[PDB]
Amino acid sequence: GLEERLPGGILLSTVETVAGYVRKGSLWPATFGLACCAIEMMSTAGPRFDIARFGMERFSATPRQADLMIVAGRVSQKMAPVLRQIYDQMVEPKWVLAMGVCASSGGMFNNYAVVQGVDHVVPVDIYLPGCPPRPEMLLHAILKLHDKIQQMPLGVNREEAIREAEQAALAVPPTIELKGLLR
Amino acid sequence: GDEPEIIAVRRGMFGNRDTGDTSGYGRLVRPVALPGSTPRPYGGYFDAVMDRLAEVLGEERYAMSIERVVVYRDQLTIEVSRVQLPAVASVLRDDPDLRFELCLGVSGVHYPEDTGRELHAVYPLMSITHNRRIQLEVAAPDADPHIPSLYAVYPTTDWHERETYDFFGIIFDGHPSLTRIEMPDDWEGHPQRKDYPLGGIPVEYHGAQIPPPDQRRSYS
Amino acid sequence: SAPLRILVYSDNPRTREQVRLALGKRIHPELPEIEYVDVATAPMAISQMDAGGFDLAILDGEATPAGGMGVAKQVKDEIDDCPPILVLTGRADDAWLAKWSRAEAAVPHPIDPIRLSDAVVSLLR
Amino acid sequence: VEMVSLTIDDHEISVPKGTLLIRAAELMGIQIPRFCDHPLLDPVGACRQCLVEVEGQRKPMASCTTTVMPDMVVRTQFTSEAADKAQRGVMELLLINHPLDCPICDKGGECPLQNQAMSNGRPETRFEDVKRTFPKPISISSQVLLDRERCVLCARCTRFSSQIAGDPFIDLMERGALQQVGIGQDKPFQSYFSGNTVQICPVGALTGTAYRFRARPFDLVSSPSVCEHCASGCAQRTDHRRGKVLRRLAGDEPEVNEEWNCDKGRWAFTYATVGDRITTPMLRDGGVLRPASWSEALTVAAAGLLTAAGSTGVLVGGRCTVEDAYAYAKFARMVLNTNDVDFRARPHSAEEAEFLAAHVAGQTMGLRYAELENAPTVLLAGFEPEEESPIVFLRLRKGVRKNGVQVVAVAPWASRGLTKLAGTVVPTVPGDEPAALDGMHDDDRLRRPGAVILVGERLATSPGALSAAVRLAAATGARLAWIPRRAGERGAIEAGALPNLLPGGRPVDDADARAEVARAWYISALPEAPGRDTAAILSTAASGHLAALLVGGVELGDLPDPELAVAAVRTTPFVVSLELRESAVTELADVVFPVAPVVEKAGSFLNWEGRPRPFAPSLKTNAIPDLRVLHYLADEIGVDLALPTAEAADAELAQLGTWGGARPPAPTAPPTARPEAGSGQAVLASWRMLLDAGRLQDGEPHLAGTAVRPVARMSAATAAGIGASDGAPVTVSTERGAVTLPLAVTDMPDGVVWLPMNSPGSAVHQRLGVTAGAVVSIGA
Amino acid sequence: AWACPADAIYVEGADNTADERYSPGERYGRVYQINYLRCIGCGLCIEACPTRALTMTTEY
Amino acid sequence: KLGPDGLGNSPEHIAKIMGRSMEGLIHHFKLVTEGIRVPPGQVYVAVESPRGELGVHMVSDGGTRPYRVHYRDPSFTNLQAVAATCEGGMVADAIAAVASIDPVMGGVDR
Ligand SMILES: CC(C)=CCC/C(C)=C\CC/C(C)=C/CC/C(C)=C\CC/C(C)=C/CC/C(C)=C/CC/C(C)=C/CC/C(C)=C/CC/C(C)=C/CC1=C(C)C(=O)c2ccccc2C1=O
Ligand SMILES: Nc1nc2c(ncn2[C@@H]2O[C@H](COP(=O)(O)OP(=O)(O)OP(=O)(O)O)[C@@H](O)[C@H]2O)c(=O)[nH]1
Ligand code: SF4
Ligand code: SF4
Ligand code: SF4
Ligand code: SF4
Ligand code: SF4
Ligand code: FES
């Protein structure tokens, strides 16, 4: 959008900060949930907690209105195409919260049927441990995503950030090479 | 028949599936037999159920249909010969004294070491009227994994014959449409067969990874 | 001839090194020289694909923040006349998803140099 | 065989006469607890854990010692309260002094004591007193730690070190509750079979220092395997964690090794991870060896080989699997159209090739371990069973102890292995072996049915020795078996990786054989020109008449003249290496291809008895076998080798089958006169120690520390004539160099000096450039 | 790690040499990793520990 | 048991297994690592889950792991009533019918 054509002066910085504040608030989750993690997501929406306090009570039934896709449960092989379709049918900017161990790495179900982490099919922004994560853990992960969204760049700043993140990522060794103290 | 049904031959102490960690303990040979034919005075109402089934079915038909009778942990299993399954199922459902109207489903179990009887289908039946229950067991070889579908007798077996097929390849001949219900139709293999690998991935760690449990050593 | 440009996408630098080792400067002396563009992050890979000028993309299905299969589906849905996609699968059971990603070819981990080279030749031929 | 009926519990079975009650229960599926019992050890009845109730016996009977007798009635713990009480009391007594070390014990999870205390022990302790204690752990060798507190004094370790291996360097010591397995003093355990004691201990008393605290069973990936090192082909179980092999247990192959290993097979698995492994293809650029892509390396290698057309030699080495050696031979004959193929990376002779073609190639299972144990007489020629093929030594010792096998060795001196076999030496200076073999045509011992003659590879170094052995076998009728040192040599022979041989024992010099193999290969015709052996190839290349070399897994230092070998590879215009490790060939090669180690590759070996020893890969890795490297190198060259995998090579070999036609003539080489050593000189005898400077033994300091002390062995008269004294350093020398080792007076034939062929500080081939049978100057 | 249903714990023991001792006795866990993207919080690990070296806090 | 360091094996149990009881230590180790061994056999056991008869066919081959464990989950069978309870009515009625079936899909698929 034209907000991405703005010059990199103070104008772009203020547009970025206001857009981040606006998007961190009103972060409507998609009406999407796979398993017991979906039950904990509902509990988070439930009175004991209040997802609504964060402007996130409107679980967008359609992906068009959804801004955040809380996977919230295990993703089977047959479901990955559906989850990717839902992700693609959301409109940018989009974010994916991998709620629970099943959504983030497959969790305990390390077998043929489970995808072993939704990042196999959709870009994940935050991983949320737990099986299921208790609602406070979900709110913590959501606030972490809010912090990430606030510092989200735009336009030329976005391009520079992408280049810098690429440069940093090209150098990190794989986890299999962090042999610290391994005999 | 009439002999114990060995589903696996376990050799070596401590449940080693291979040569074994300590020398000299691998020479034991213990066949793993499931409970065999029960002596005739079955417990509780099992005696009445079997007597009624043998009365409704002709002596010849009963002998041809009922391959075995087992009473294990106060639960009655009837090893029903393949082919004859629909007839005995109809008798069980319709006979007023049996009246096993509620079929709870079909469960597949794979015995890769049970020659000629690798694939077993288990039919848990319950009679609400008599507050009774039994299980039927139908064995089929891995070479011809065909069983008569009970769709006409127990429509509830629909999707079960499918799940059991999807996960074992039992063909349940005569089923209206035996299509995969859990796995995708393009899926290759039948996951719950023992020969089908678990299909996991190594768990990632800093400097190391743990292979899936099916690859790592186990004792049974 | 035009140096065929290949996009190698993987958060794991060692997977990129193995892919570049299987495919030398020339897969065969009959084929053109090969230039490799390494991308570790999905945003960079997507932007490079949008810039175009690639003859093949090798996407690691095991990439941590964004899997190669997802990126393959995204590029084949988002870039017009996108180049053939080769996906590296972390397990055999991933084959189904590899088919879903519509990748022209799938090469299981660990990357067999010869299998990868043959698949690349088939895709470029 | 006599058969006796018997009743265990309520069930009845029949078993061979002489069977032990515990064995009968095993066959019947009854699990009687046991610690001291071992099927392969003579029963001792120590631990008293295996007590059962026998009708007509007042006391409980140790089933591990009670032979089955007809009509005997036995009730185990499953059907006899007295037997169960006895067994559980024995278990309680076994656990009172045991340390609460299960979490820290290496045997945890795999402990027979844990399992049998669960299945036959009290739920909780009654022992509220003070436990007996020892300092723990104490090293009895560089490899084996001993935790005397966990020791149940089952004596399995000691009984193994005495009966199975003739190395009783551990024994039960002290008395009563203080009794403990020990070595007595600083003298280490020091046997090639020490690791077996670790695998035979039913508790965490004996543990391998290498495997210490590195894993518990649940996280081990365990795969069946075959040992790479000797031609014994032991079945093994390779256990690896996070992609690193931690140990290799003995497996269970009654027809090969039963439940035993040598230390080499158990612990020599670190060679592939010492840092010298070649990880990527390499190319010679600017005189330096640079990492190169597979495509570029294959292209360069194909270009060089095509530019070298027929002027190429293929050194296959002895490490390749049967499939790998078959691929080397097929590449050489189909792709390079040359017969210059030789797996012998070691002292060898053309007479050796003729003998292998005549009597070895294409003839499998002619002799078997089971026959060694029963052979009334076994004659060892140029063979040291303990140093080469240790499981052959174990089987021979088992035969000696059980069936009274008589062992004779035509060797310069009695090695410890021969003494442990109770073998009688026929003292012969090396090179004089043919005279001794011809001098035994009248030996009544060899006439006896089942008599066997085991010939080591080293007889190839003695002219006419193999012909003499063949004549001796023909005259006496004793079956003759050839036992190499490397696992891949017999597979190489079956693969036809020799200048005069084709796959399946098919002779090259036979138009029908060439036509048959070519038809099986879908090729016009195979090369007919006679092939040059390893020595001929090296001499030609050094002279500059060889355009290129294909060297696979060859240790140049192991060749009789390593200086010649290095000169040959250096002068060869183009050298292609298929090497797992950085090596001397790699330092001088133009193209280097990494090849998967055995643990990462599917394949099969052939042990000396020709038995197939298959194995699937244990580690899934991107590394590829020599098979695929050669196949795709040929494809780049433009010839479809049709060997994409070990399965394809095995199928092709099976399709070819054995030759089955006219057997090649026997060598019949003449017994060339042996050199005469003058004053200050002696004839050199030597064989390779089991644990020496071998490359595959690298990366395992403990195993190397277990190696026998290198010593130059001389007759007393010769040492006196050289001015040396027992234990004093002695130097043997040639024009190339010298080897200095402590002297050992050994009662050898006069004028013969024996050295370890490749022990550290000896390296006879490298340091002297000569092999066994040569004359070497001696000095104090 | 043995009892973990999800293989979420990786542990490597090592000797408590007199020069560097980390725990009483002969062995200590020098490498100890929990993959919290595989942890299911079942608590089998703590029930498995024979030393109470592993507990589970209320921090989430 | 709970303590200032959180939830973990009670100090009394630690003392029993690591300090005084060898049999106790062996039992803890084995029952935690391999677990119990279940004699071979088949058993079908059913309970009244909130959604109906939750049945479990459990087959043991004598080992420390369940040879076969199949859940007859009531939701799986109940979902076969969607055709009966939805055909003929409106989509708004189908929503109510499916909700009344109260299917929890974890039990349905397993
Ligand atoms: C143009 C311009 C800028 C002009 C200037 C002026 C200006 C700024 C604008 C003027 C004002 C305007 C137009 C403002 C824009 C905003 C606007 C118009 C409106 C949007 C805001 C709005 C409509 C607010 C109210 C919405 C609202 C009432 C929200 C509450 C919704 C609720 C109750 C949500 C909770 C839903 C919930 C429990 C979620 C869980 C979903 C789950 C778990 C899914 C998965 C799942 C399910 C669904 C199960 O039920 C389930 C059951 C059993 C087992 C498993 C599962 C399972 O897996
Ligand atoms: N091509 C190929 N090379 C191998 C293979 N296995 C080992 N090698 C290499 O071959 C070289 C020679 O090994 P060997 O001839 O067995 O020497 P060694 O390791 O000391 O063993 P010995 O035969 O007792 O001398 C070593 O440097 C290894 O790196 C293999 O499977 N294929
Ligand atoms: S992470 Fe746990 S709670 Fe969430 S879906 Fe997976 S198993 Fe269910
Ligand atoms: S030897 Fe067995 S009983 Fe003794 S501490 Fe080790 S695992 Fe425990
Ligand atoms: S060290 Fe092991 S094998 Fe030897 S006596 Fe003790 S418990 Fe038995
Ligand atoms: S005898 Fe030979 S084959 Fe057997 S374990 Fe020892 S080195 Fe390996
Ligand atoms: S809570 Fe402990 S035992 Fe359970 S999964 Fe997590 S790490 Fe493993
Ligand atoms: S095993 Fe027989 S007394 Fe020890």
UniProtKB/Swiss-Prot annotation, chain A:
Fetch the SUPFAM superfamilies from UniProt. HydA/Nqo6-like
GO CC terms, sorted: plasma membrane; respiratory chain complex I
Name the domain of life. Bacteria
Task: Please list the GO terms describing molecular function.
Answer: 4 iron, 4 sulfur cluster binding; iron ion binding; NADH dehydrogenase (ubiquinone) activity; NADH:ubiquinone reductase (non-electrogenic) activity; quinone binding
Under Gene3D superfamilies, the record lists: 3.40.50.12280
Localization, per the record, is: Cell membrane
Which keywords does the record carry? 4Fe-4S, Cell membrane, Iron, Iron-sulfur, Membrane, Metal-binding, NAD, Quinone, Translocase, Transport
Give the primary localization class.
Answer: membrane
Cofactor note text: Binds 1 [4Fe-4S] cluster.
What InterPro entries does the annotation carry? Answer: NADH_UbQ_OxRdtase-like_20kDa (IPR006137), NADH_UQ_OxRdtase_20Kd_su (IPR006138)
- KW NAD (keyword) present: yes
Binding residues for [4Fe-4S] cluster: 36-37, 102, 131
Q: Write down the required cofactor(s).
A: [4Fe-4S] cluster
PROSITE patterns linked to this entry:
COMPLEX1_20K
**What's the Enzyme Commission number for this chain?**
7.1.1.-
Pfam families reported in the protein's UniProt record = Oxidored_q6 (PF01058)
The topology of this chain with respect to the membrane is:
Peripheral membrane protein
Q: List this protein's GO terms for biological process.
A: aerobic respiration; electron transport coupled proton transport
Q: Which family does it belong to?
A: Belongs to the complex I 20 kDa subunit family.
Q: Which HAMAP family match?
A: NDH1_NuoB (MF_01356)
Q: How does it assemble?
A: NDH-1 is composed of 14 different subunits. Subunits NuoB, C, D, E, F, and G constitute the peripheral sector of the complex.
Q: Write the protein's name.
A: NADH-quinone oxidoreductase subunit B
Write down the species.
Mycolicibacterium smegmatis (strain ATCC 700084 / mc(2)155) (Mycobacterium smegmatis)
Whichever gene encodes this chain, its name is nuoB
Swiss-Prot record, chain B:
State its Enzyme Commission number(s): 7.1.1.-
Q: What is its main location?
A: membrane
Localization per record: Cell membrane
Quote any Pfam family the record assigns.
Answer: Complex1_30kDa
In terms of domain of life, where is this protein from? Bacteria
Molecular functions (GO terms): NADH dehydrogenase (ubiquinone) activity; NADH:ubiquinone reductase (non-electrogenic) activity; quinone binding
Q: Which residues form a coiled coil?
A: none
Q: What reaction does this catalyse? A: a quinone + NADH + 5 H(+)(in) = a quinol + NAD(+) + 4 H(+)(out)
Q: How does it assemble?
A: NDH-1 is composed of 14 different subunits. Subunits NuoB, C, D, E, F, and G constitute the peripheral sector of the complex.
Q: What does this protein do?
A: NDH-1 shuttles electrons from NADH, via FMN and iron-sulfur (Fe-S) centers, to quinones in the respiratory chain. The immediate electron acceptor for the enzyme in this species is believed to be a menaquinone. Couples the redox reaction to proton translocation (for every two electrons transferred, four hydrogen ions are translocated across the cytoplasmic membrane), and thus conserves the redox energy in a proton gradient.
Q: Which PANTHER family match?
A: NADH DEHYDROGENASE [UBIQUINONE] IRON-SULFUR PROTEIN 3, MITOCHONDRIAL, NADH DEHYDROGENASE UBIQUINONE IRON-SULFUR PROTEIN 3
Q: Which family does it belong to?
A: Belongs to the complex I 30 kDa subunit family.
Q: What is this protein called?
A: NADH-quinone oxidoreductase subunit C
Q: Which organism is it from?
A: Mycolicibacterium smegmatis (strain ATCC 700084 / mc(2)155)
Which gene is transcribed and translated to give this protein?
nuoC
UniProtKB/Swiss-Prot annotation, chain E:
Q: What are the residue boundaries of the 4Fe-4S ferredoxin-type domain, all occurrences included?
A: 30-59
Instruction: Name a biological process GO annotation.
Output: aerobic respiration
State the Gene Ontology terms under molecular function.
Answer: 4 iron, 4 sulfur cluster binding; iron ion binding; NADH:ubiquinone reductase (non-electrogenic) activity; quinone binding
Chain residues that bind [4Fe-4S] cluster 2: 4, 39, 42, 45
Keywords assigned: 4Fe-4S, Cell membrane, Iron, Iron-sulfur, Membrane, Metal-binding, NAD, Quinone, Repeat, Translocase
Q: Where in the cell is it found?
A: Cell membrane
Q: Where does [4Fe-4S] cluster 1 bind?
A: 49
The record's Gene Ontology cellular component field reads:
plasma membrane
The keyword RNA-binding is annotated on this UniProt entry:
no
Subunit info here reads: NDH-1 is composed of 14 different subunits. Subunits NuoA, H, J, K, L, M, N constitute the membrane sector of the complex.
Its family remark reads:
Belongs to the complex I 23 kDa subunit family.
Function (record text) = NDH-1 shuttles electrons from NADH, via FMN and iron-sulfur (Fe-S) centers, to quinones in the respiratory chain. The immediate electron acceptor for the enzyme in this species is believed to be menaquinone. Couples the redox reaction to proton translocation (for every two electrons transferred, four hydrogen ions are translocated across the cytoplasmic membrane), and thus conserves the redox energy in a proton gradient.
**What name appears for this protein in its UniProt entry?**
NADH-quinone oxidoreductase subunit I
Q: What is the lineage of its organism?
A: Bacteria, Bacillati, Actinomycetota, Actinomycetes, Mycobacteriales
**Gene name in the database record:** nuoI
Q: Which residues of the full protein are shown?
A: 61 to 120 of 180
Swiss-Prot record, chain F:
Under the cellular component aspect of Gene Ontology, which terms does the record hold? plasma membrane
Keyword field = Cell membrane, Membrane, NAD, Quinone, Translocase, Transport
Which superkingdom?
Bacteria
Q: Where, per UniProt, does this protein localize?
A: Cell membrane
**Which Gene Ontology molecular-function terms are recorded?**
NAD binding; NADH:ubiquinone reductase (non-electrogenic) activity; quinone binding
Q: Which family does it belong to?
A: Belongs to the complex I 49 kDa subunit family.
Cited function: NDH-1 shuttles electrons from NADH, via FMN and iron-sulfur (Fe-S) centers, to quinones in the respiratory chain. The immediate electron acceptor for the enzyme in this species is believed to be a menaquinone. Couples the redox reaction to proton translocation (for every two electrons transferred, four hydrogen ions are translocated across the cytoplasmic membrane), and thus conserves the redox energy in a proton gradient.
Complex and partners: NDH-1 is composed of 14 different subunits. Subunits NuoB, C, D, E, F, and G constitute the peripheral sector of the complex.
> How is this protein named in the record?
NADH-quinone oxidoreductase subunit D
Organism field = Mycolicibacterium smegmatis (strain ATCC 700084 / mc(2)155)
